[PDB]
Design an enzyme around this catalytic site. Structure first.
Site, short mmCIF file in Angstrom:
data_model
loop_
_atom_site.label_atom_id
_atom_site.label_comp_id
_atom_site.label_asym_id
_atom_site.label_seq_id
_atom_site.Cartn_x
_atom_site.Cartn_y
_atom_site.Cartn_z
N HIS A 62 53.60 46.57 34.65
CA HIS A 62 53.57 45.11 34.80
C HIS A 62 52.98 44.47 33.56
N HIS A 92 43.90 41.96 30.61
CA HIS A 92 45.31 42.19 30.34
C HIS A 92 45.91 40.86 29.92
CE1 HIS A 92 45.07 40.77 34.54
NE2 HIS A 92 46.17 40.11 34.23
N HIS A 94 49.77 38.31 29.60
CA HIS A 94 51.05 37.88 30.14
C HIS A 94 51.76 37.17 29.02
CE1 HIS A 94 48.65 38.08 33.99
NE2 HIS A 94 49.75 38.71 34.36
N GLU A 104 50.75 31.76 32.22
CA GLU A 104 50.92 31.57 33.65
C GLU A 104 50.48 30.15 33.99
OE1 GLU A 104 49.16 35.18 35.61
OE2 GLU A 104 51.32 35.56 35.73
N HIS A 117 43.76 37.44 30.56
CA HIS A 117 42.96 37.40 31.78
C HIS A 117 41.87 38.46 31.73
CE1 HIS A 117 46.51 35.52 34.26
NE2 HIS A 117 45.88 34.64 33.50
N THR A 196 47.49 36.82 40.26
CA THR A 196 48.85 36.35 40.05
C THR A 196 49.90 37.42 40.18
OG1 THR A 196 48.68 36.61 37.64
CG2 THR A 196 47.95 34.52 38.59
N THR A 197 49.46 38.61 40.60
CA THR A 197 50.35 39.74 40.84
C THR A 197 50.04 40.28 42.21
OG1 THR A 197 48.81 41.31 39.83
CG2 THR A 197 50.56 40.40 38.42
ZN LIG Z 1 46.85 38.30 34.82
#
Ligand SMILES: [Zn+2]
Length: 258
Positions: A62, A92, A94, A104, A117, A196-197
């Site tokens: 991911h 991590h 995005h 995000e 994040h 958010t996952t």
């Molecule tokens: Zn995140």
């Protein structure tokens, strides 16, 4: 078959396996700078990362995560809208397939090239697993990335990505100082939200910094060379691993600045 960011397993599909996806405090959201309320009672953020101990970096299909030793209060976040000490466990990013998208959260509908994040958990709960089951269990520090000048402190991360190109791969990643990823100012916006996952649990207190950090086109380009797939499978580039903004509903975004 499982969740991902493709046309057949993307964010629009998550609700079937994770009903909370249509919850009351889902993230990310669009930050309307003119509707956010300045809260004078918000204390400054306290970031103590001097004793941070990174352990490993890995591609989980991911995104790529950099994990830290959270067995003691080595790297913690305090202050702000938080009550108690929160320990850093991992960070991590995005990102998008183009510089015009990737973040995000959005600010007045503006999308950034990527979003970092830094995930912390409330020490009161003993461990991360217990923390995610609580409304005030996690505190995630969100930092926007815009394309411009290179960020020296991010280079160590970009140079090891080649060793964890495919899903499942991991590598030793010690002595990385997360302080090199922070912007100059710590002014922020905060609101109650979720991961958010999947599992998308509503256990997060979001702290989104107003000031983005700049990274070079070359640095973000390396992010885009990662694969969602595992080794020995059709190559699918890891890009656009971001969830679209969700309804704010009955929530108010507060700002630490005016
Ligand atoms: Zn995140």
């Amino acid at each position: 078959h499982h969740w991902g960011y493709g046309k057949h397993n993307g964010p629009e599909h998550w609700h079937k396996d994770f009903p909370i996806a249509k919850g009351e405090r889902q993230s990310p959201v669009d930050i309307d700078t003119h509707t956010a309320k300045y809260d004078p009672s918000l204390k400054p953020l306290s970031v103590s990362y001097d004793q941070a101990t990174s352990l490993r970096i890995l591609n989980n299909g991911h995104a790529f995560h950099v994990e830290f030793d959270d067995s003691q209060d080595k790297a913690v976040l305090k202050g702000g809208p938080l009550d108690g000490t929160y320990r850093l466990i991992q960070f991590h990013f995005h990102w998008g397939s183009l510089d015009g998208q990737g973040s995000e959260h959005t600010v007045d509908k503006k999308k950034y090239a990527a979003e970092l994040h830094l995930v912390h958990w409330n020490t009161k709960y003993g461990d991360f697993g217990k923390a995610v089951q609580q409304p005030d269990g996690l505190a995630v520090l969100g930092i926007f990335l815009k394309v411009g000048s290179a960020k020296p402190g991010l280079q160590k991360v970009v140079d090891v990505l080649d060793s964890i190109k495919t899903k499942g791969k991991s590598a030793d990643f010690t002595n990385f100082d997360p302080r090199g990823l922070l912007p100059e100012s710590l002014d922020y916006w905060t609101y109650p939200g979720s991961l958010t996952t999947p599992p998308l649990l509503e256990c997060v207190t979001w702290i989104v910094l107003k000031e983005p950090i700049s990274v070079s086109s070359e640095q973000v380009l390396k992010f885009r060379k990662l694969n969602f797939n595992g080794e020995g499978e059709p190559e699918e580039l890891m890009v656009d691993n971001w969830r679209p903004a969700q309804p704010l509903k009955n929530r108010q975004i507060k700002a630490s600045f005016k």
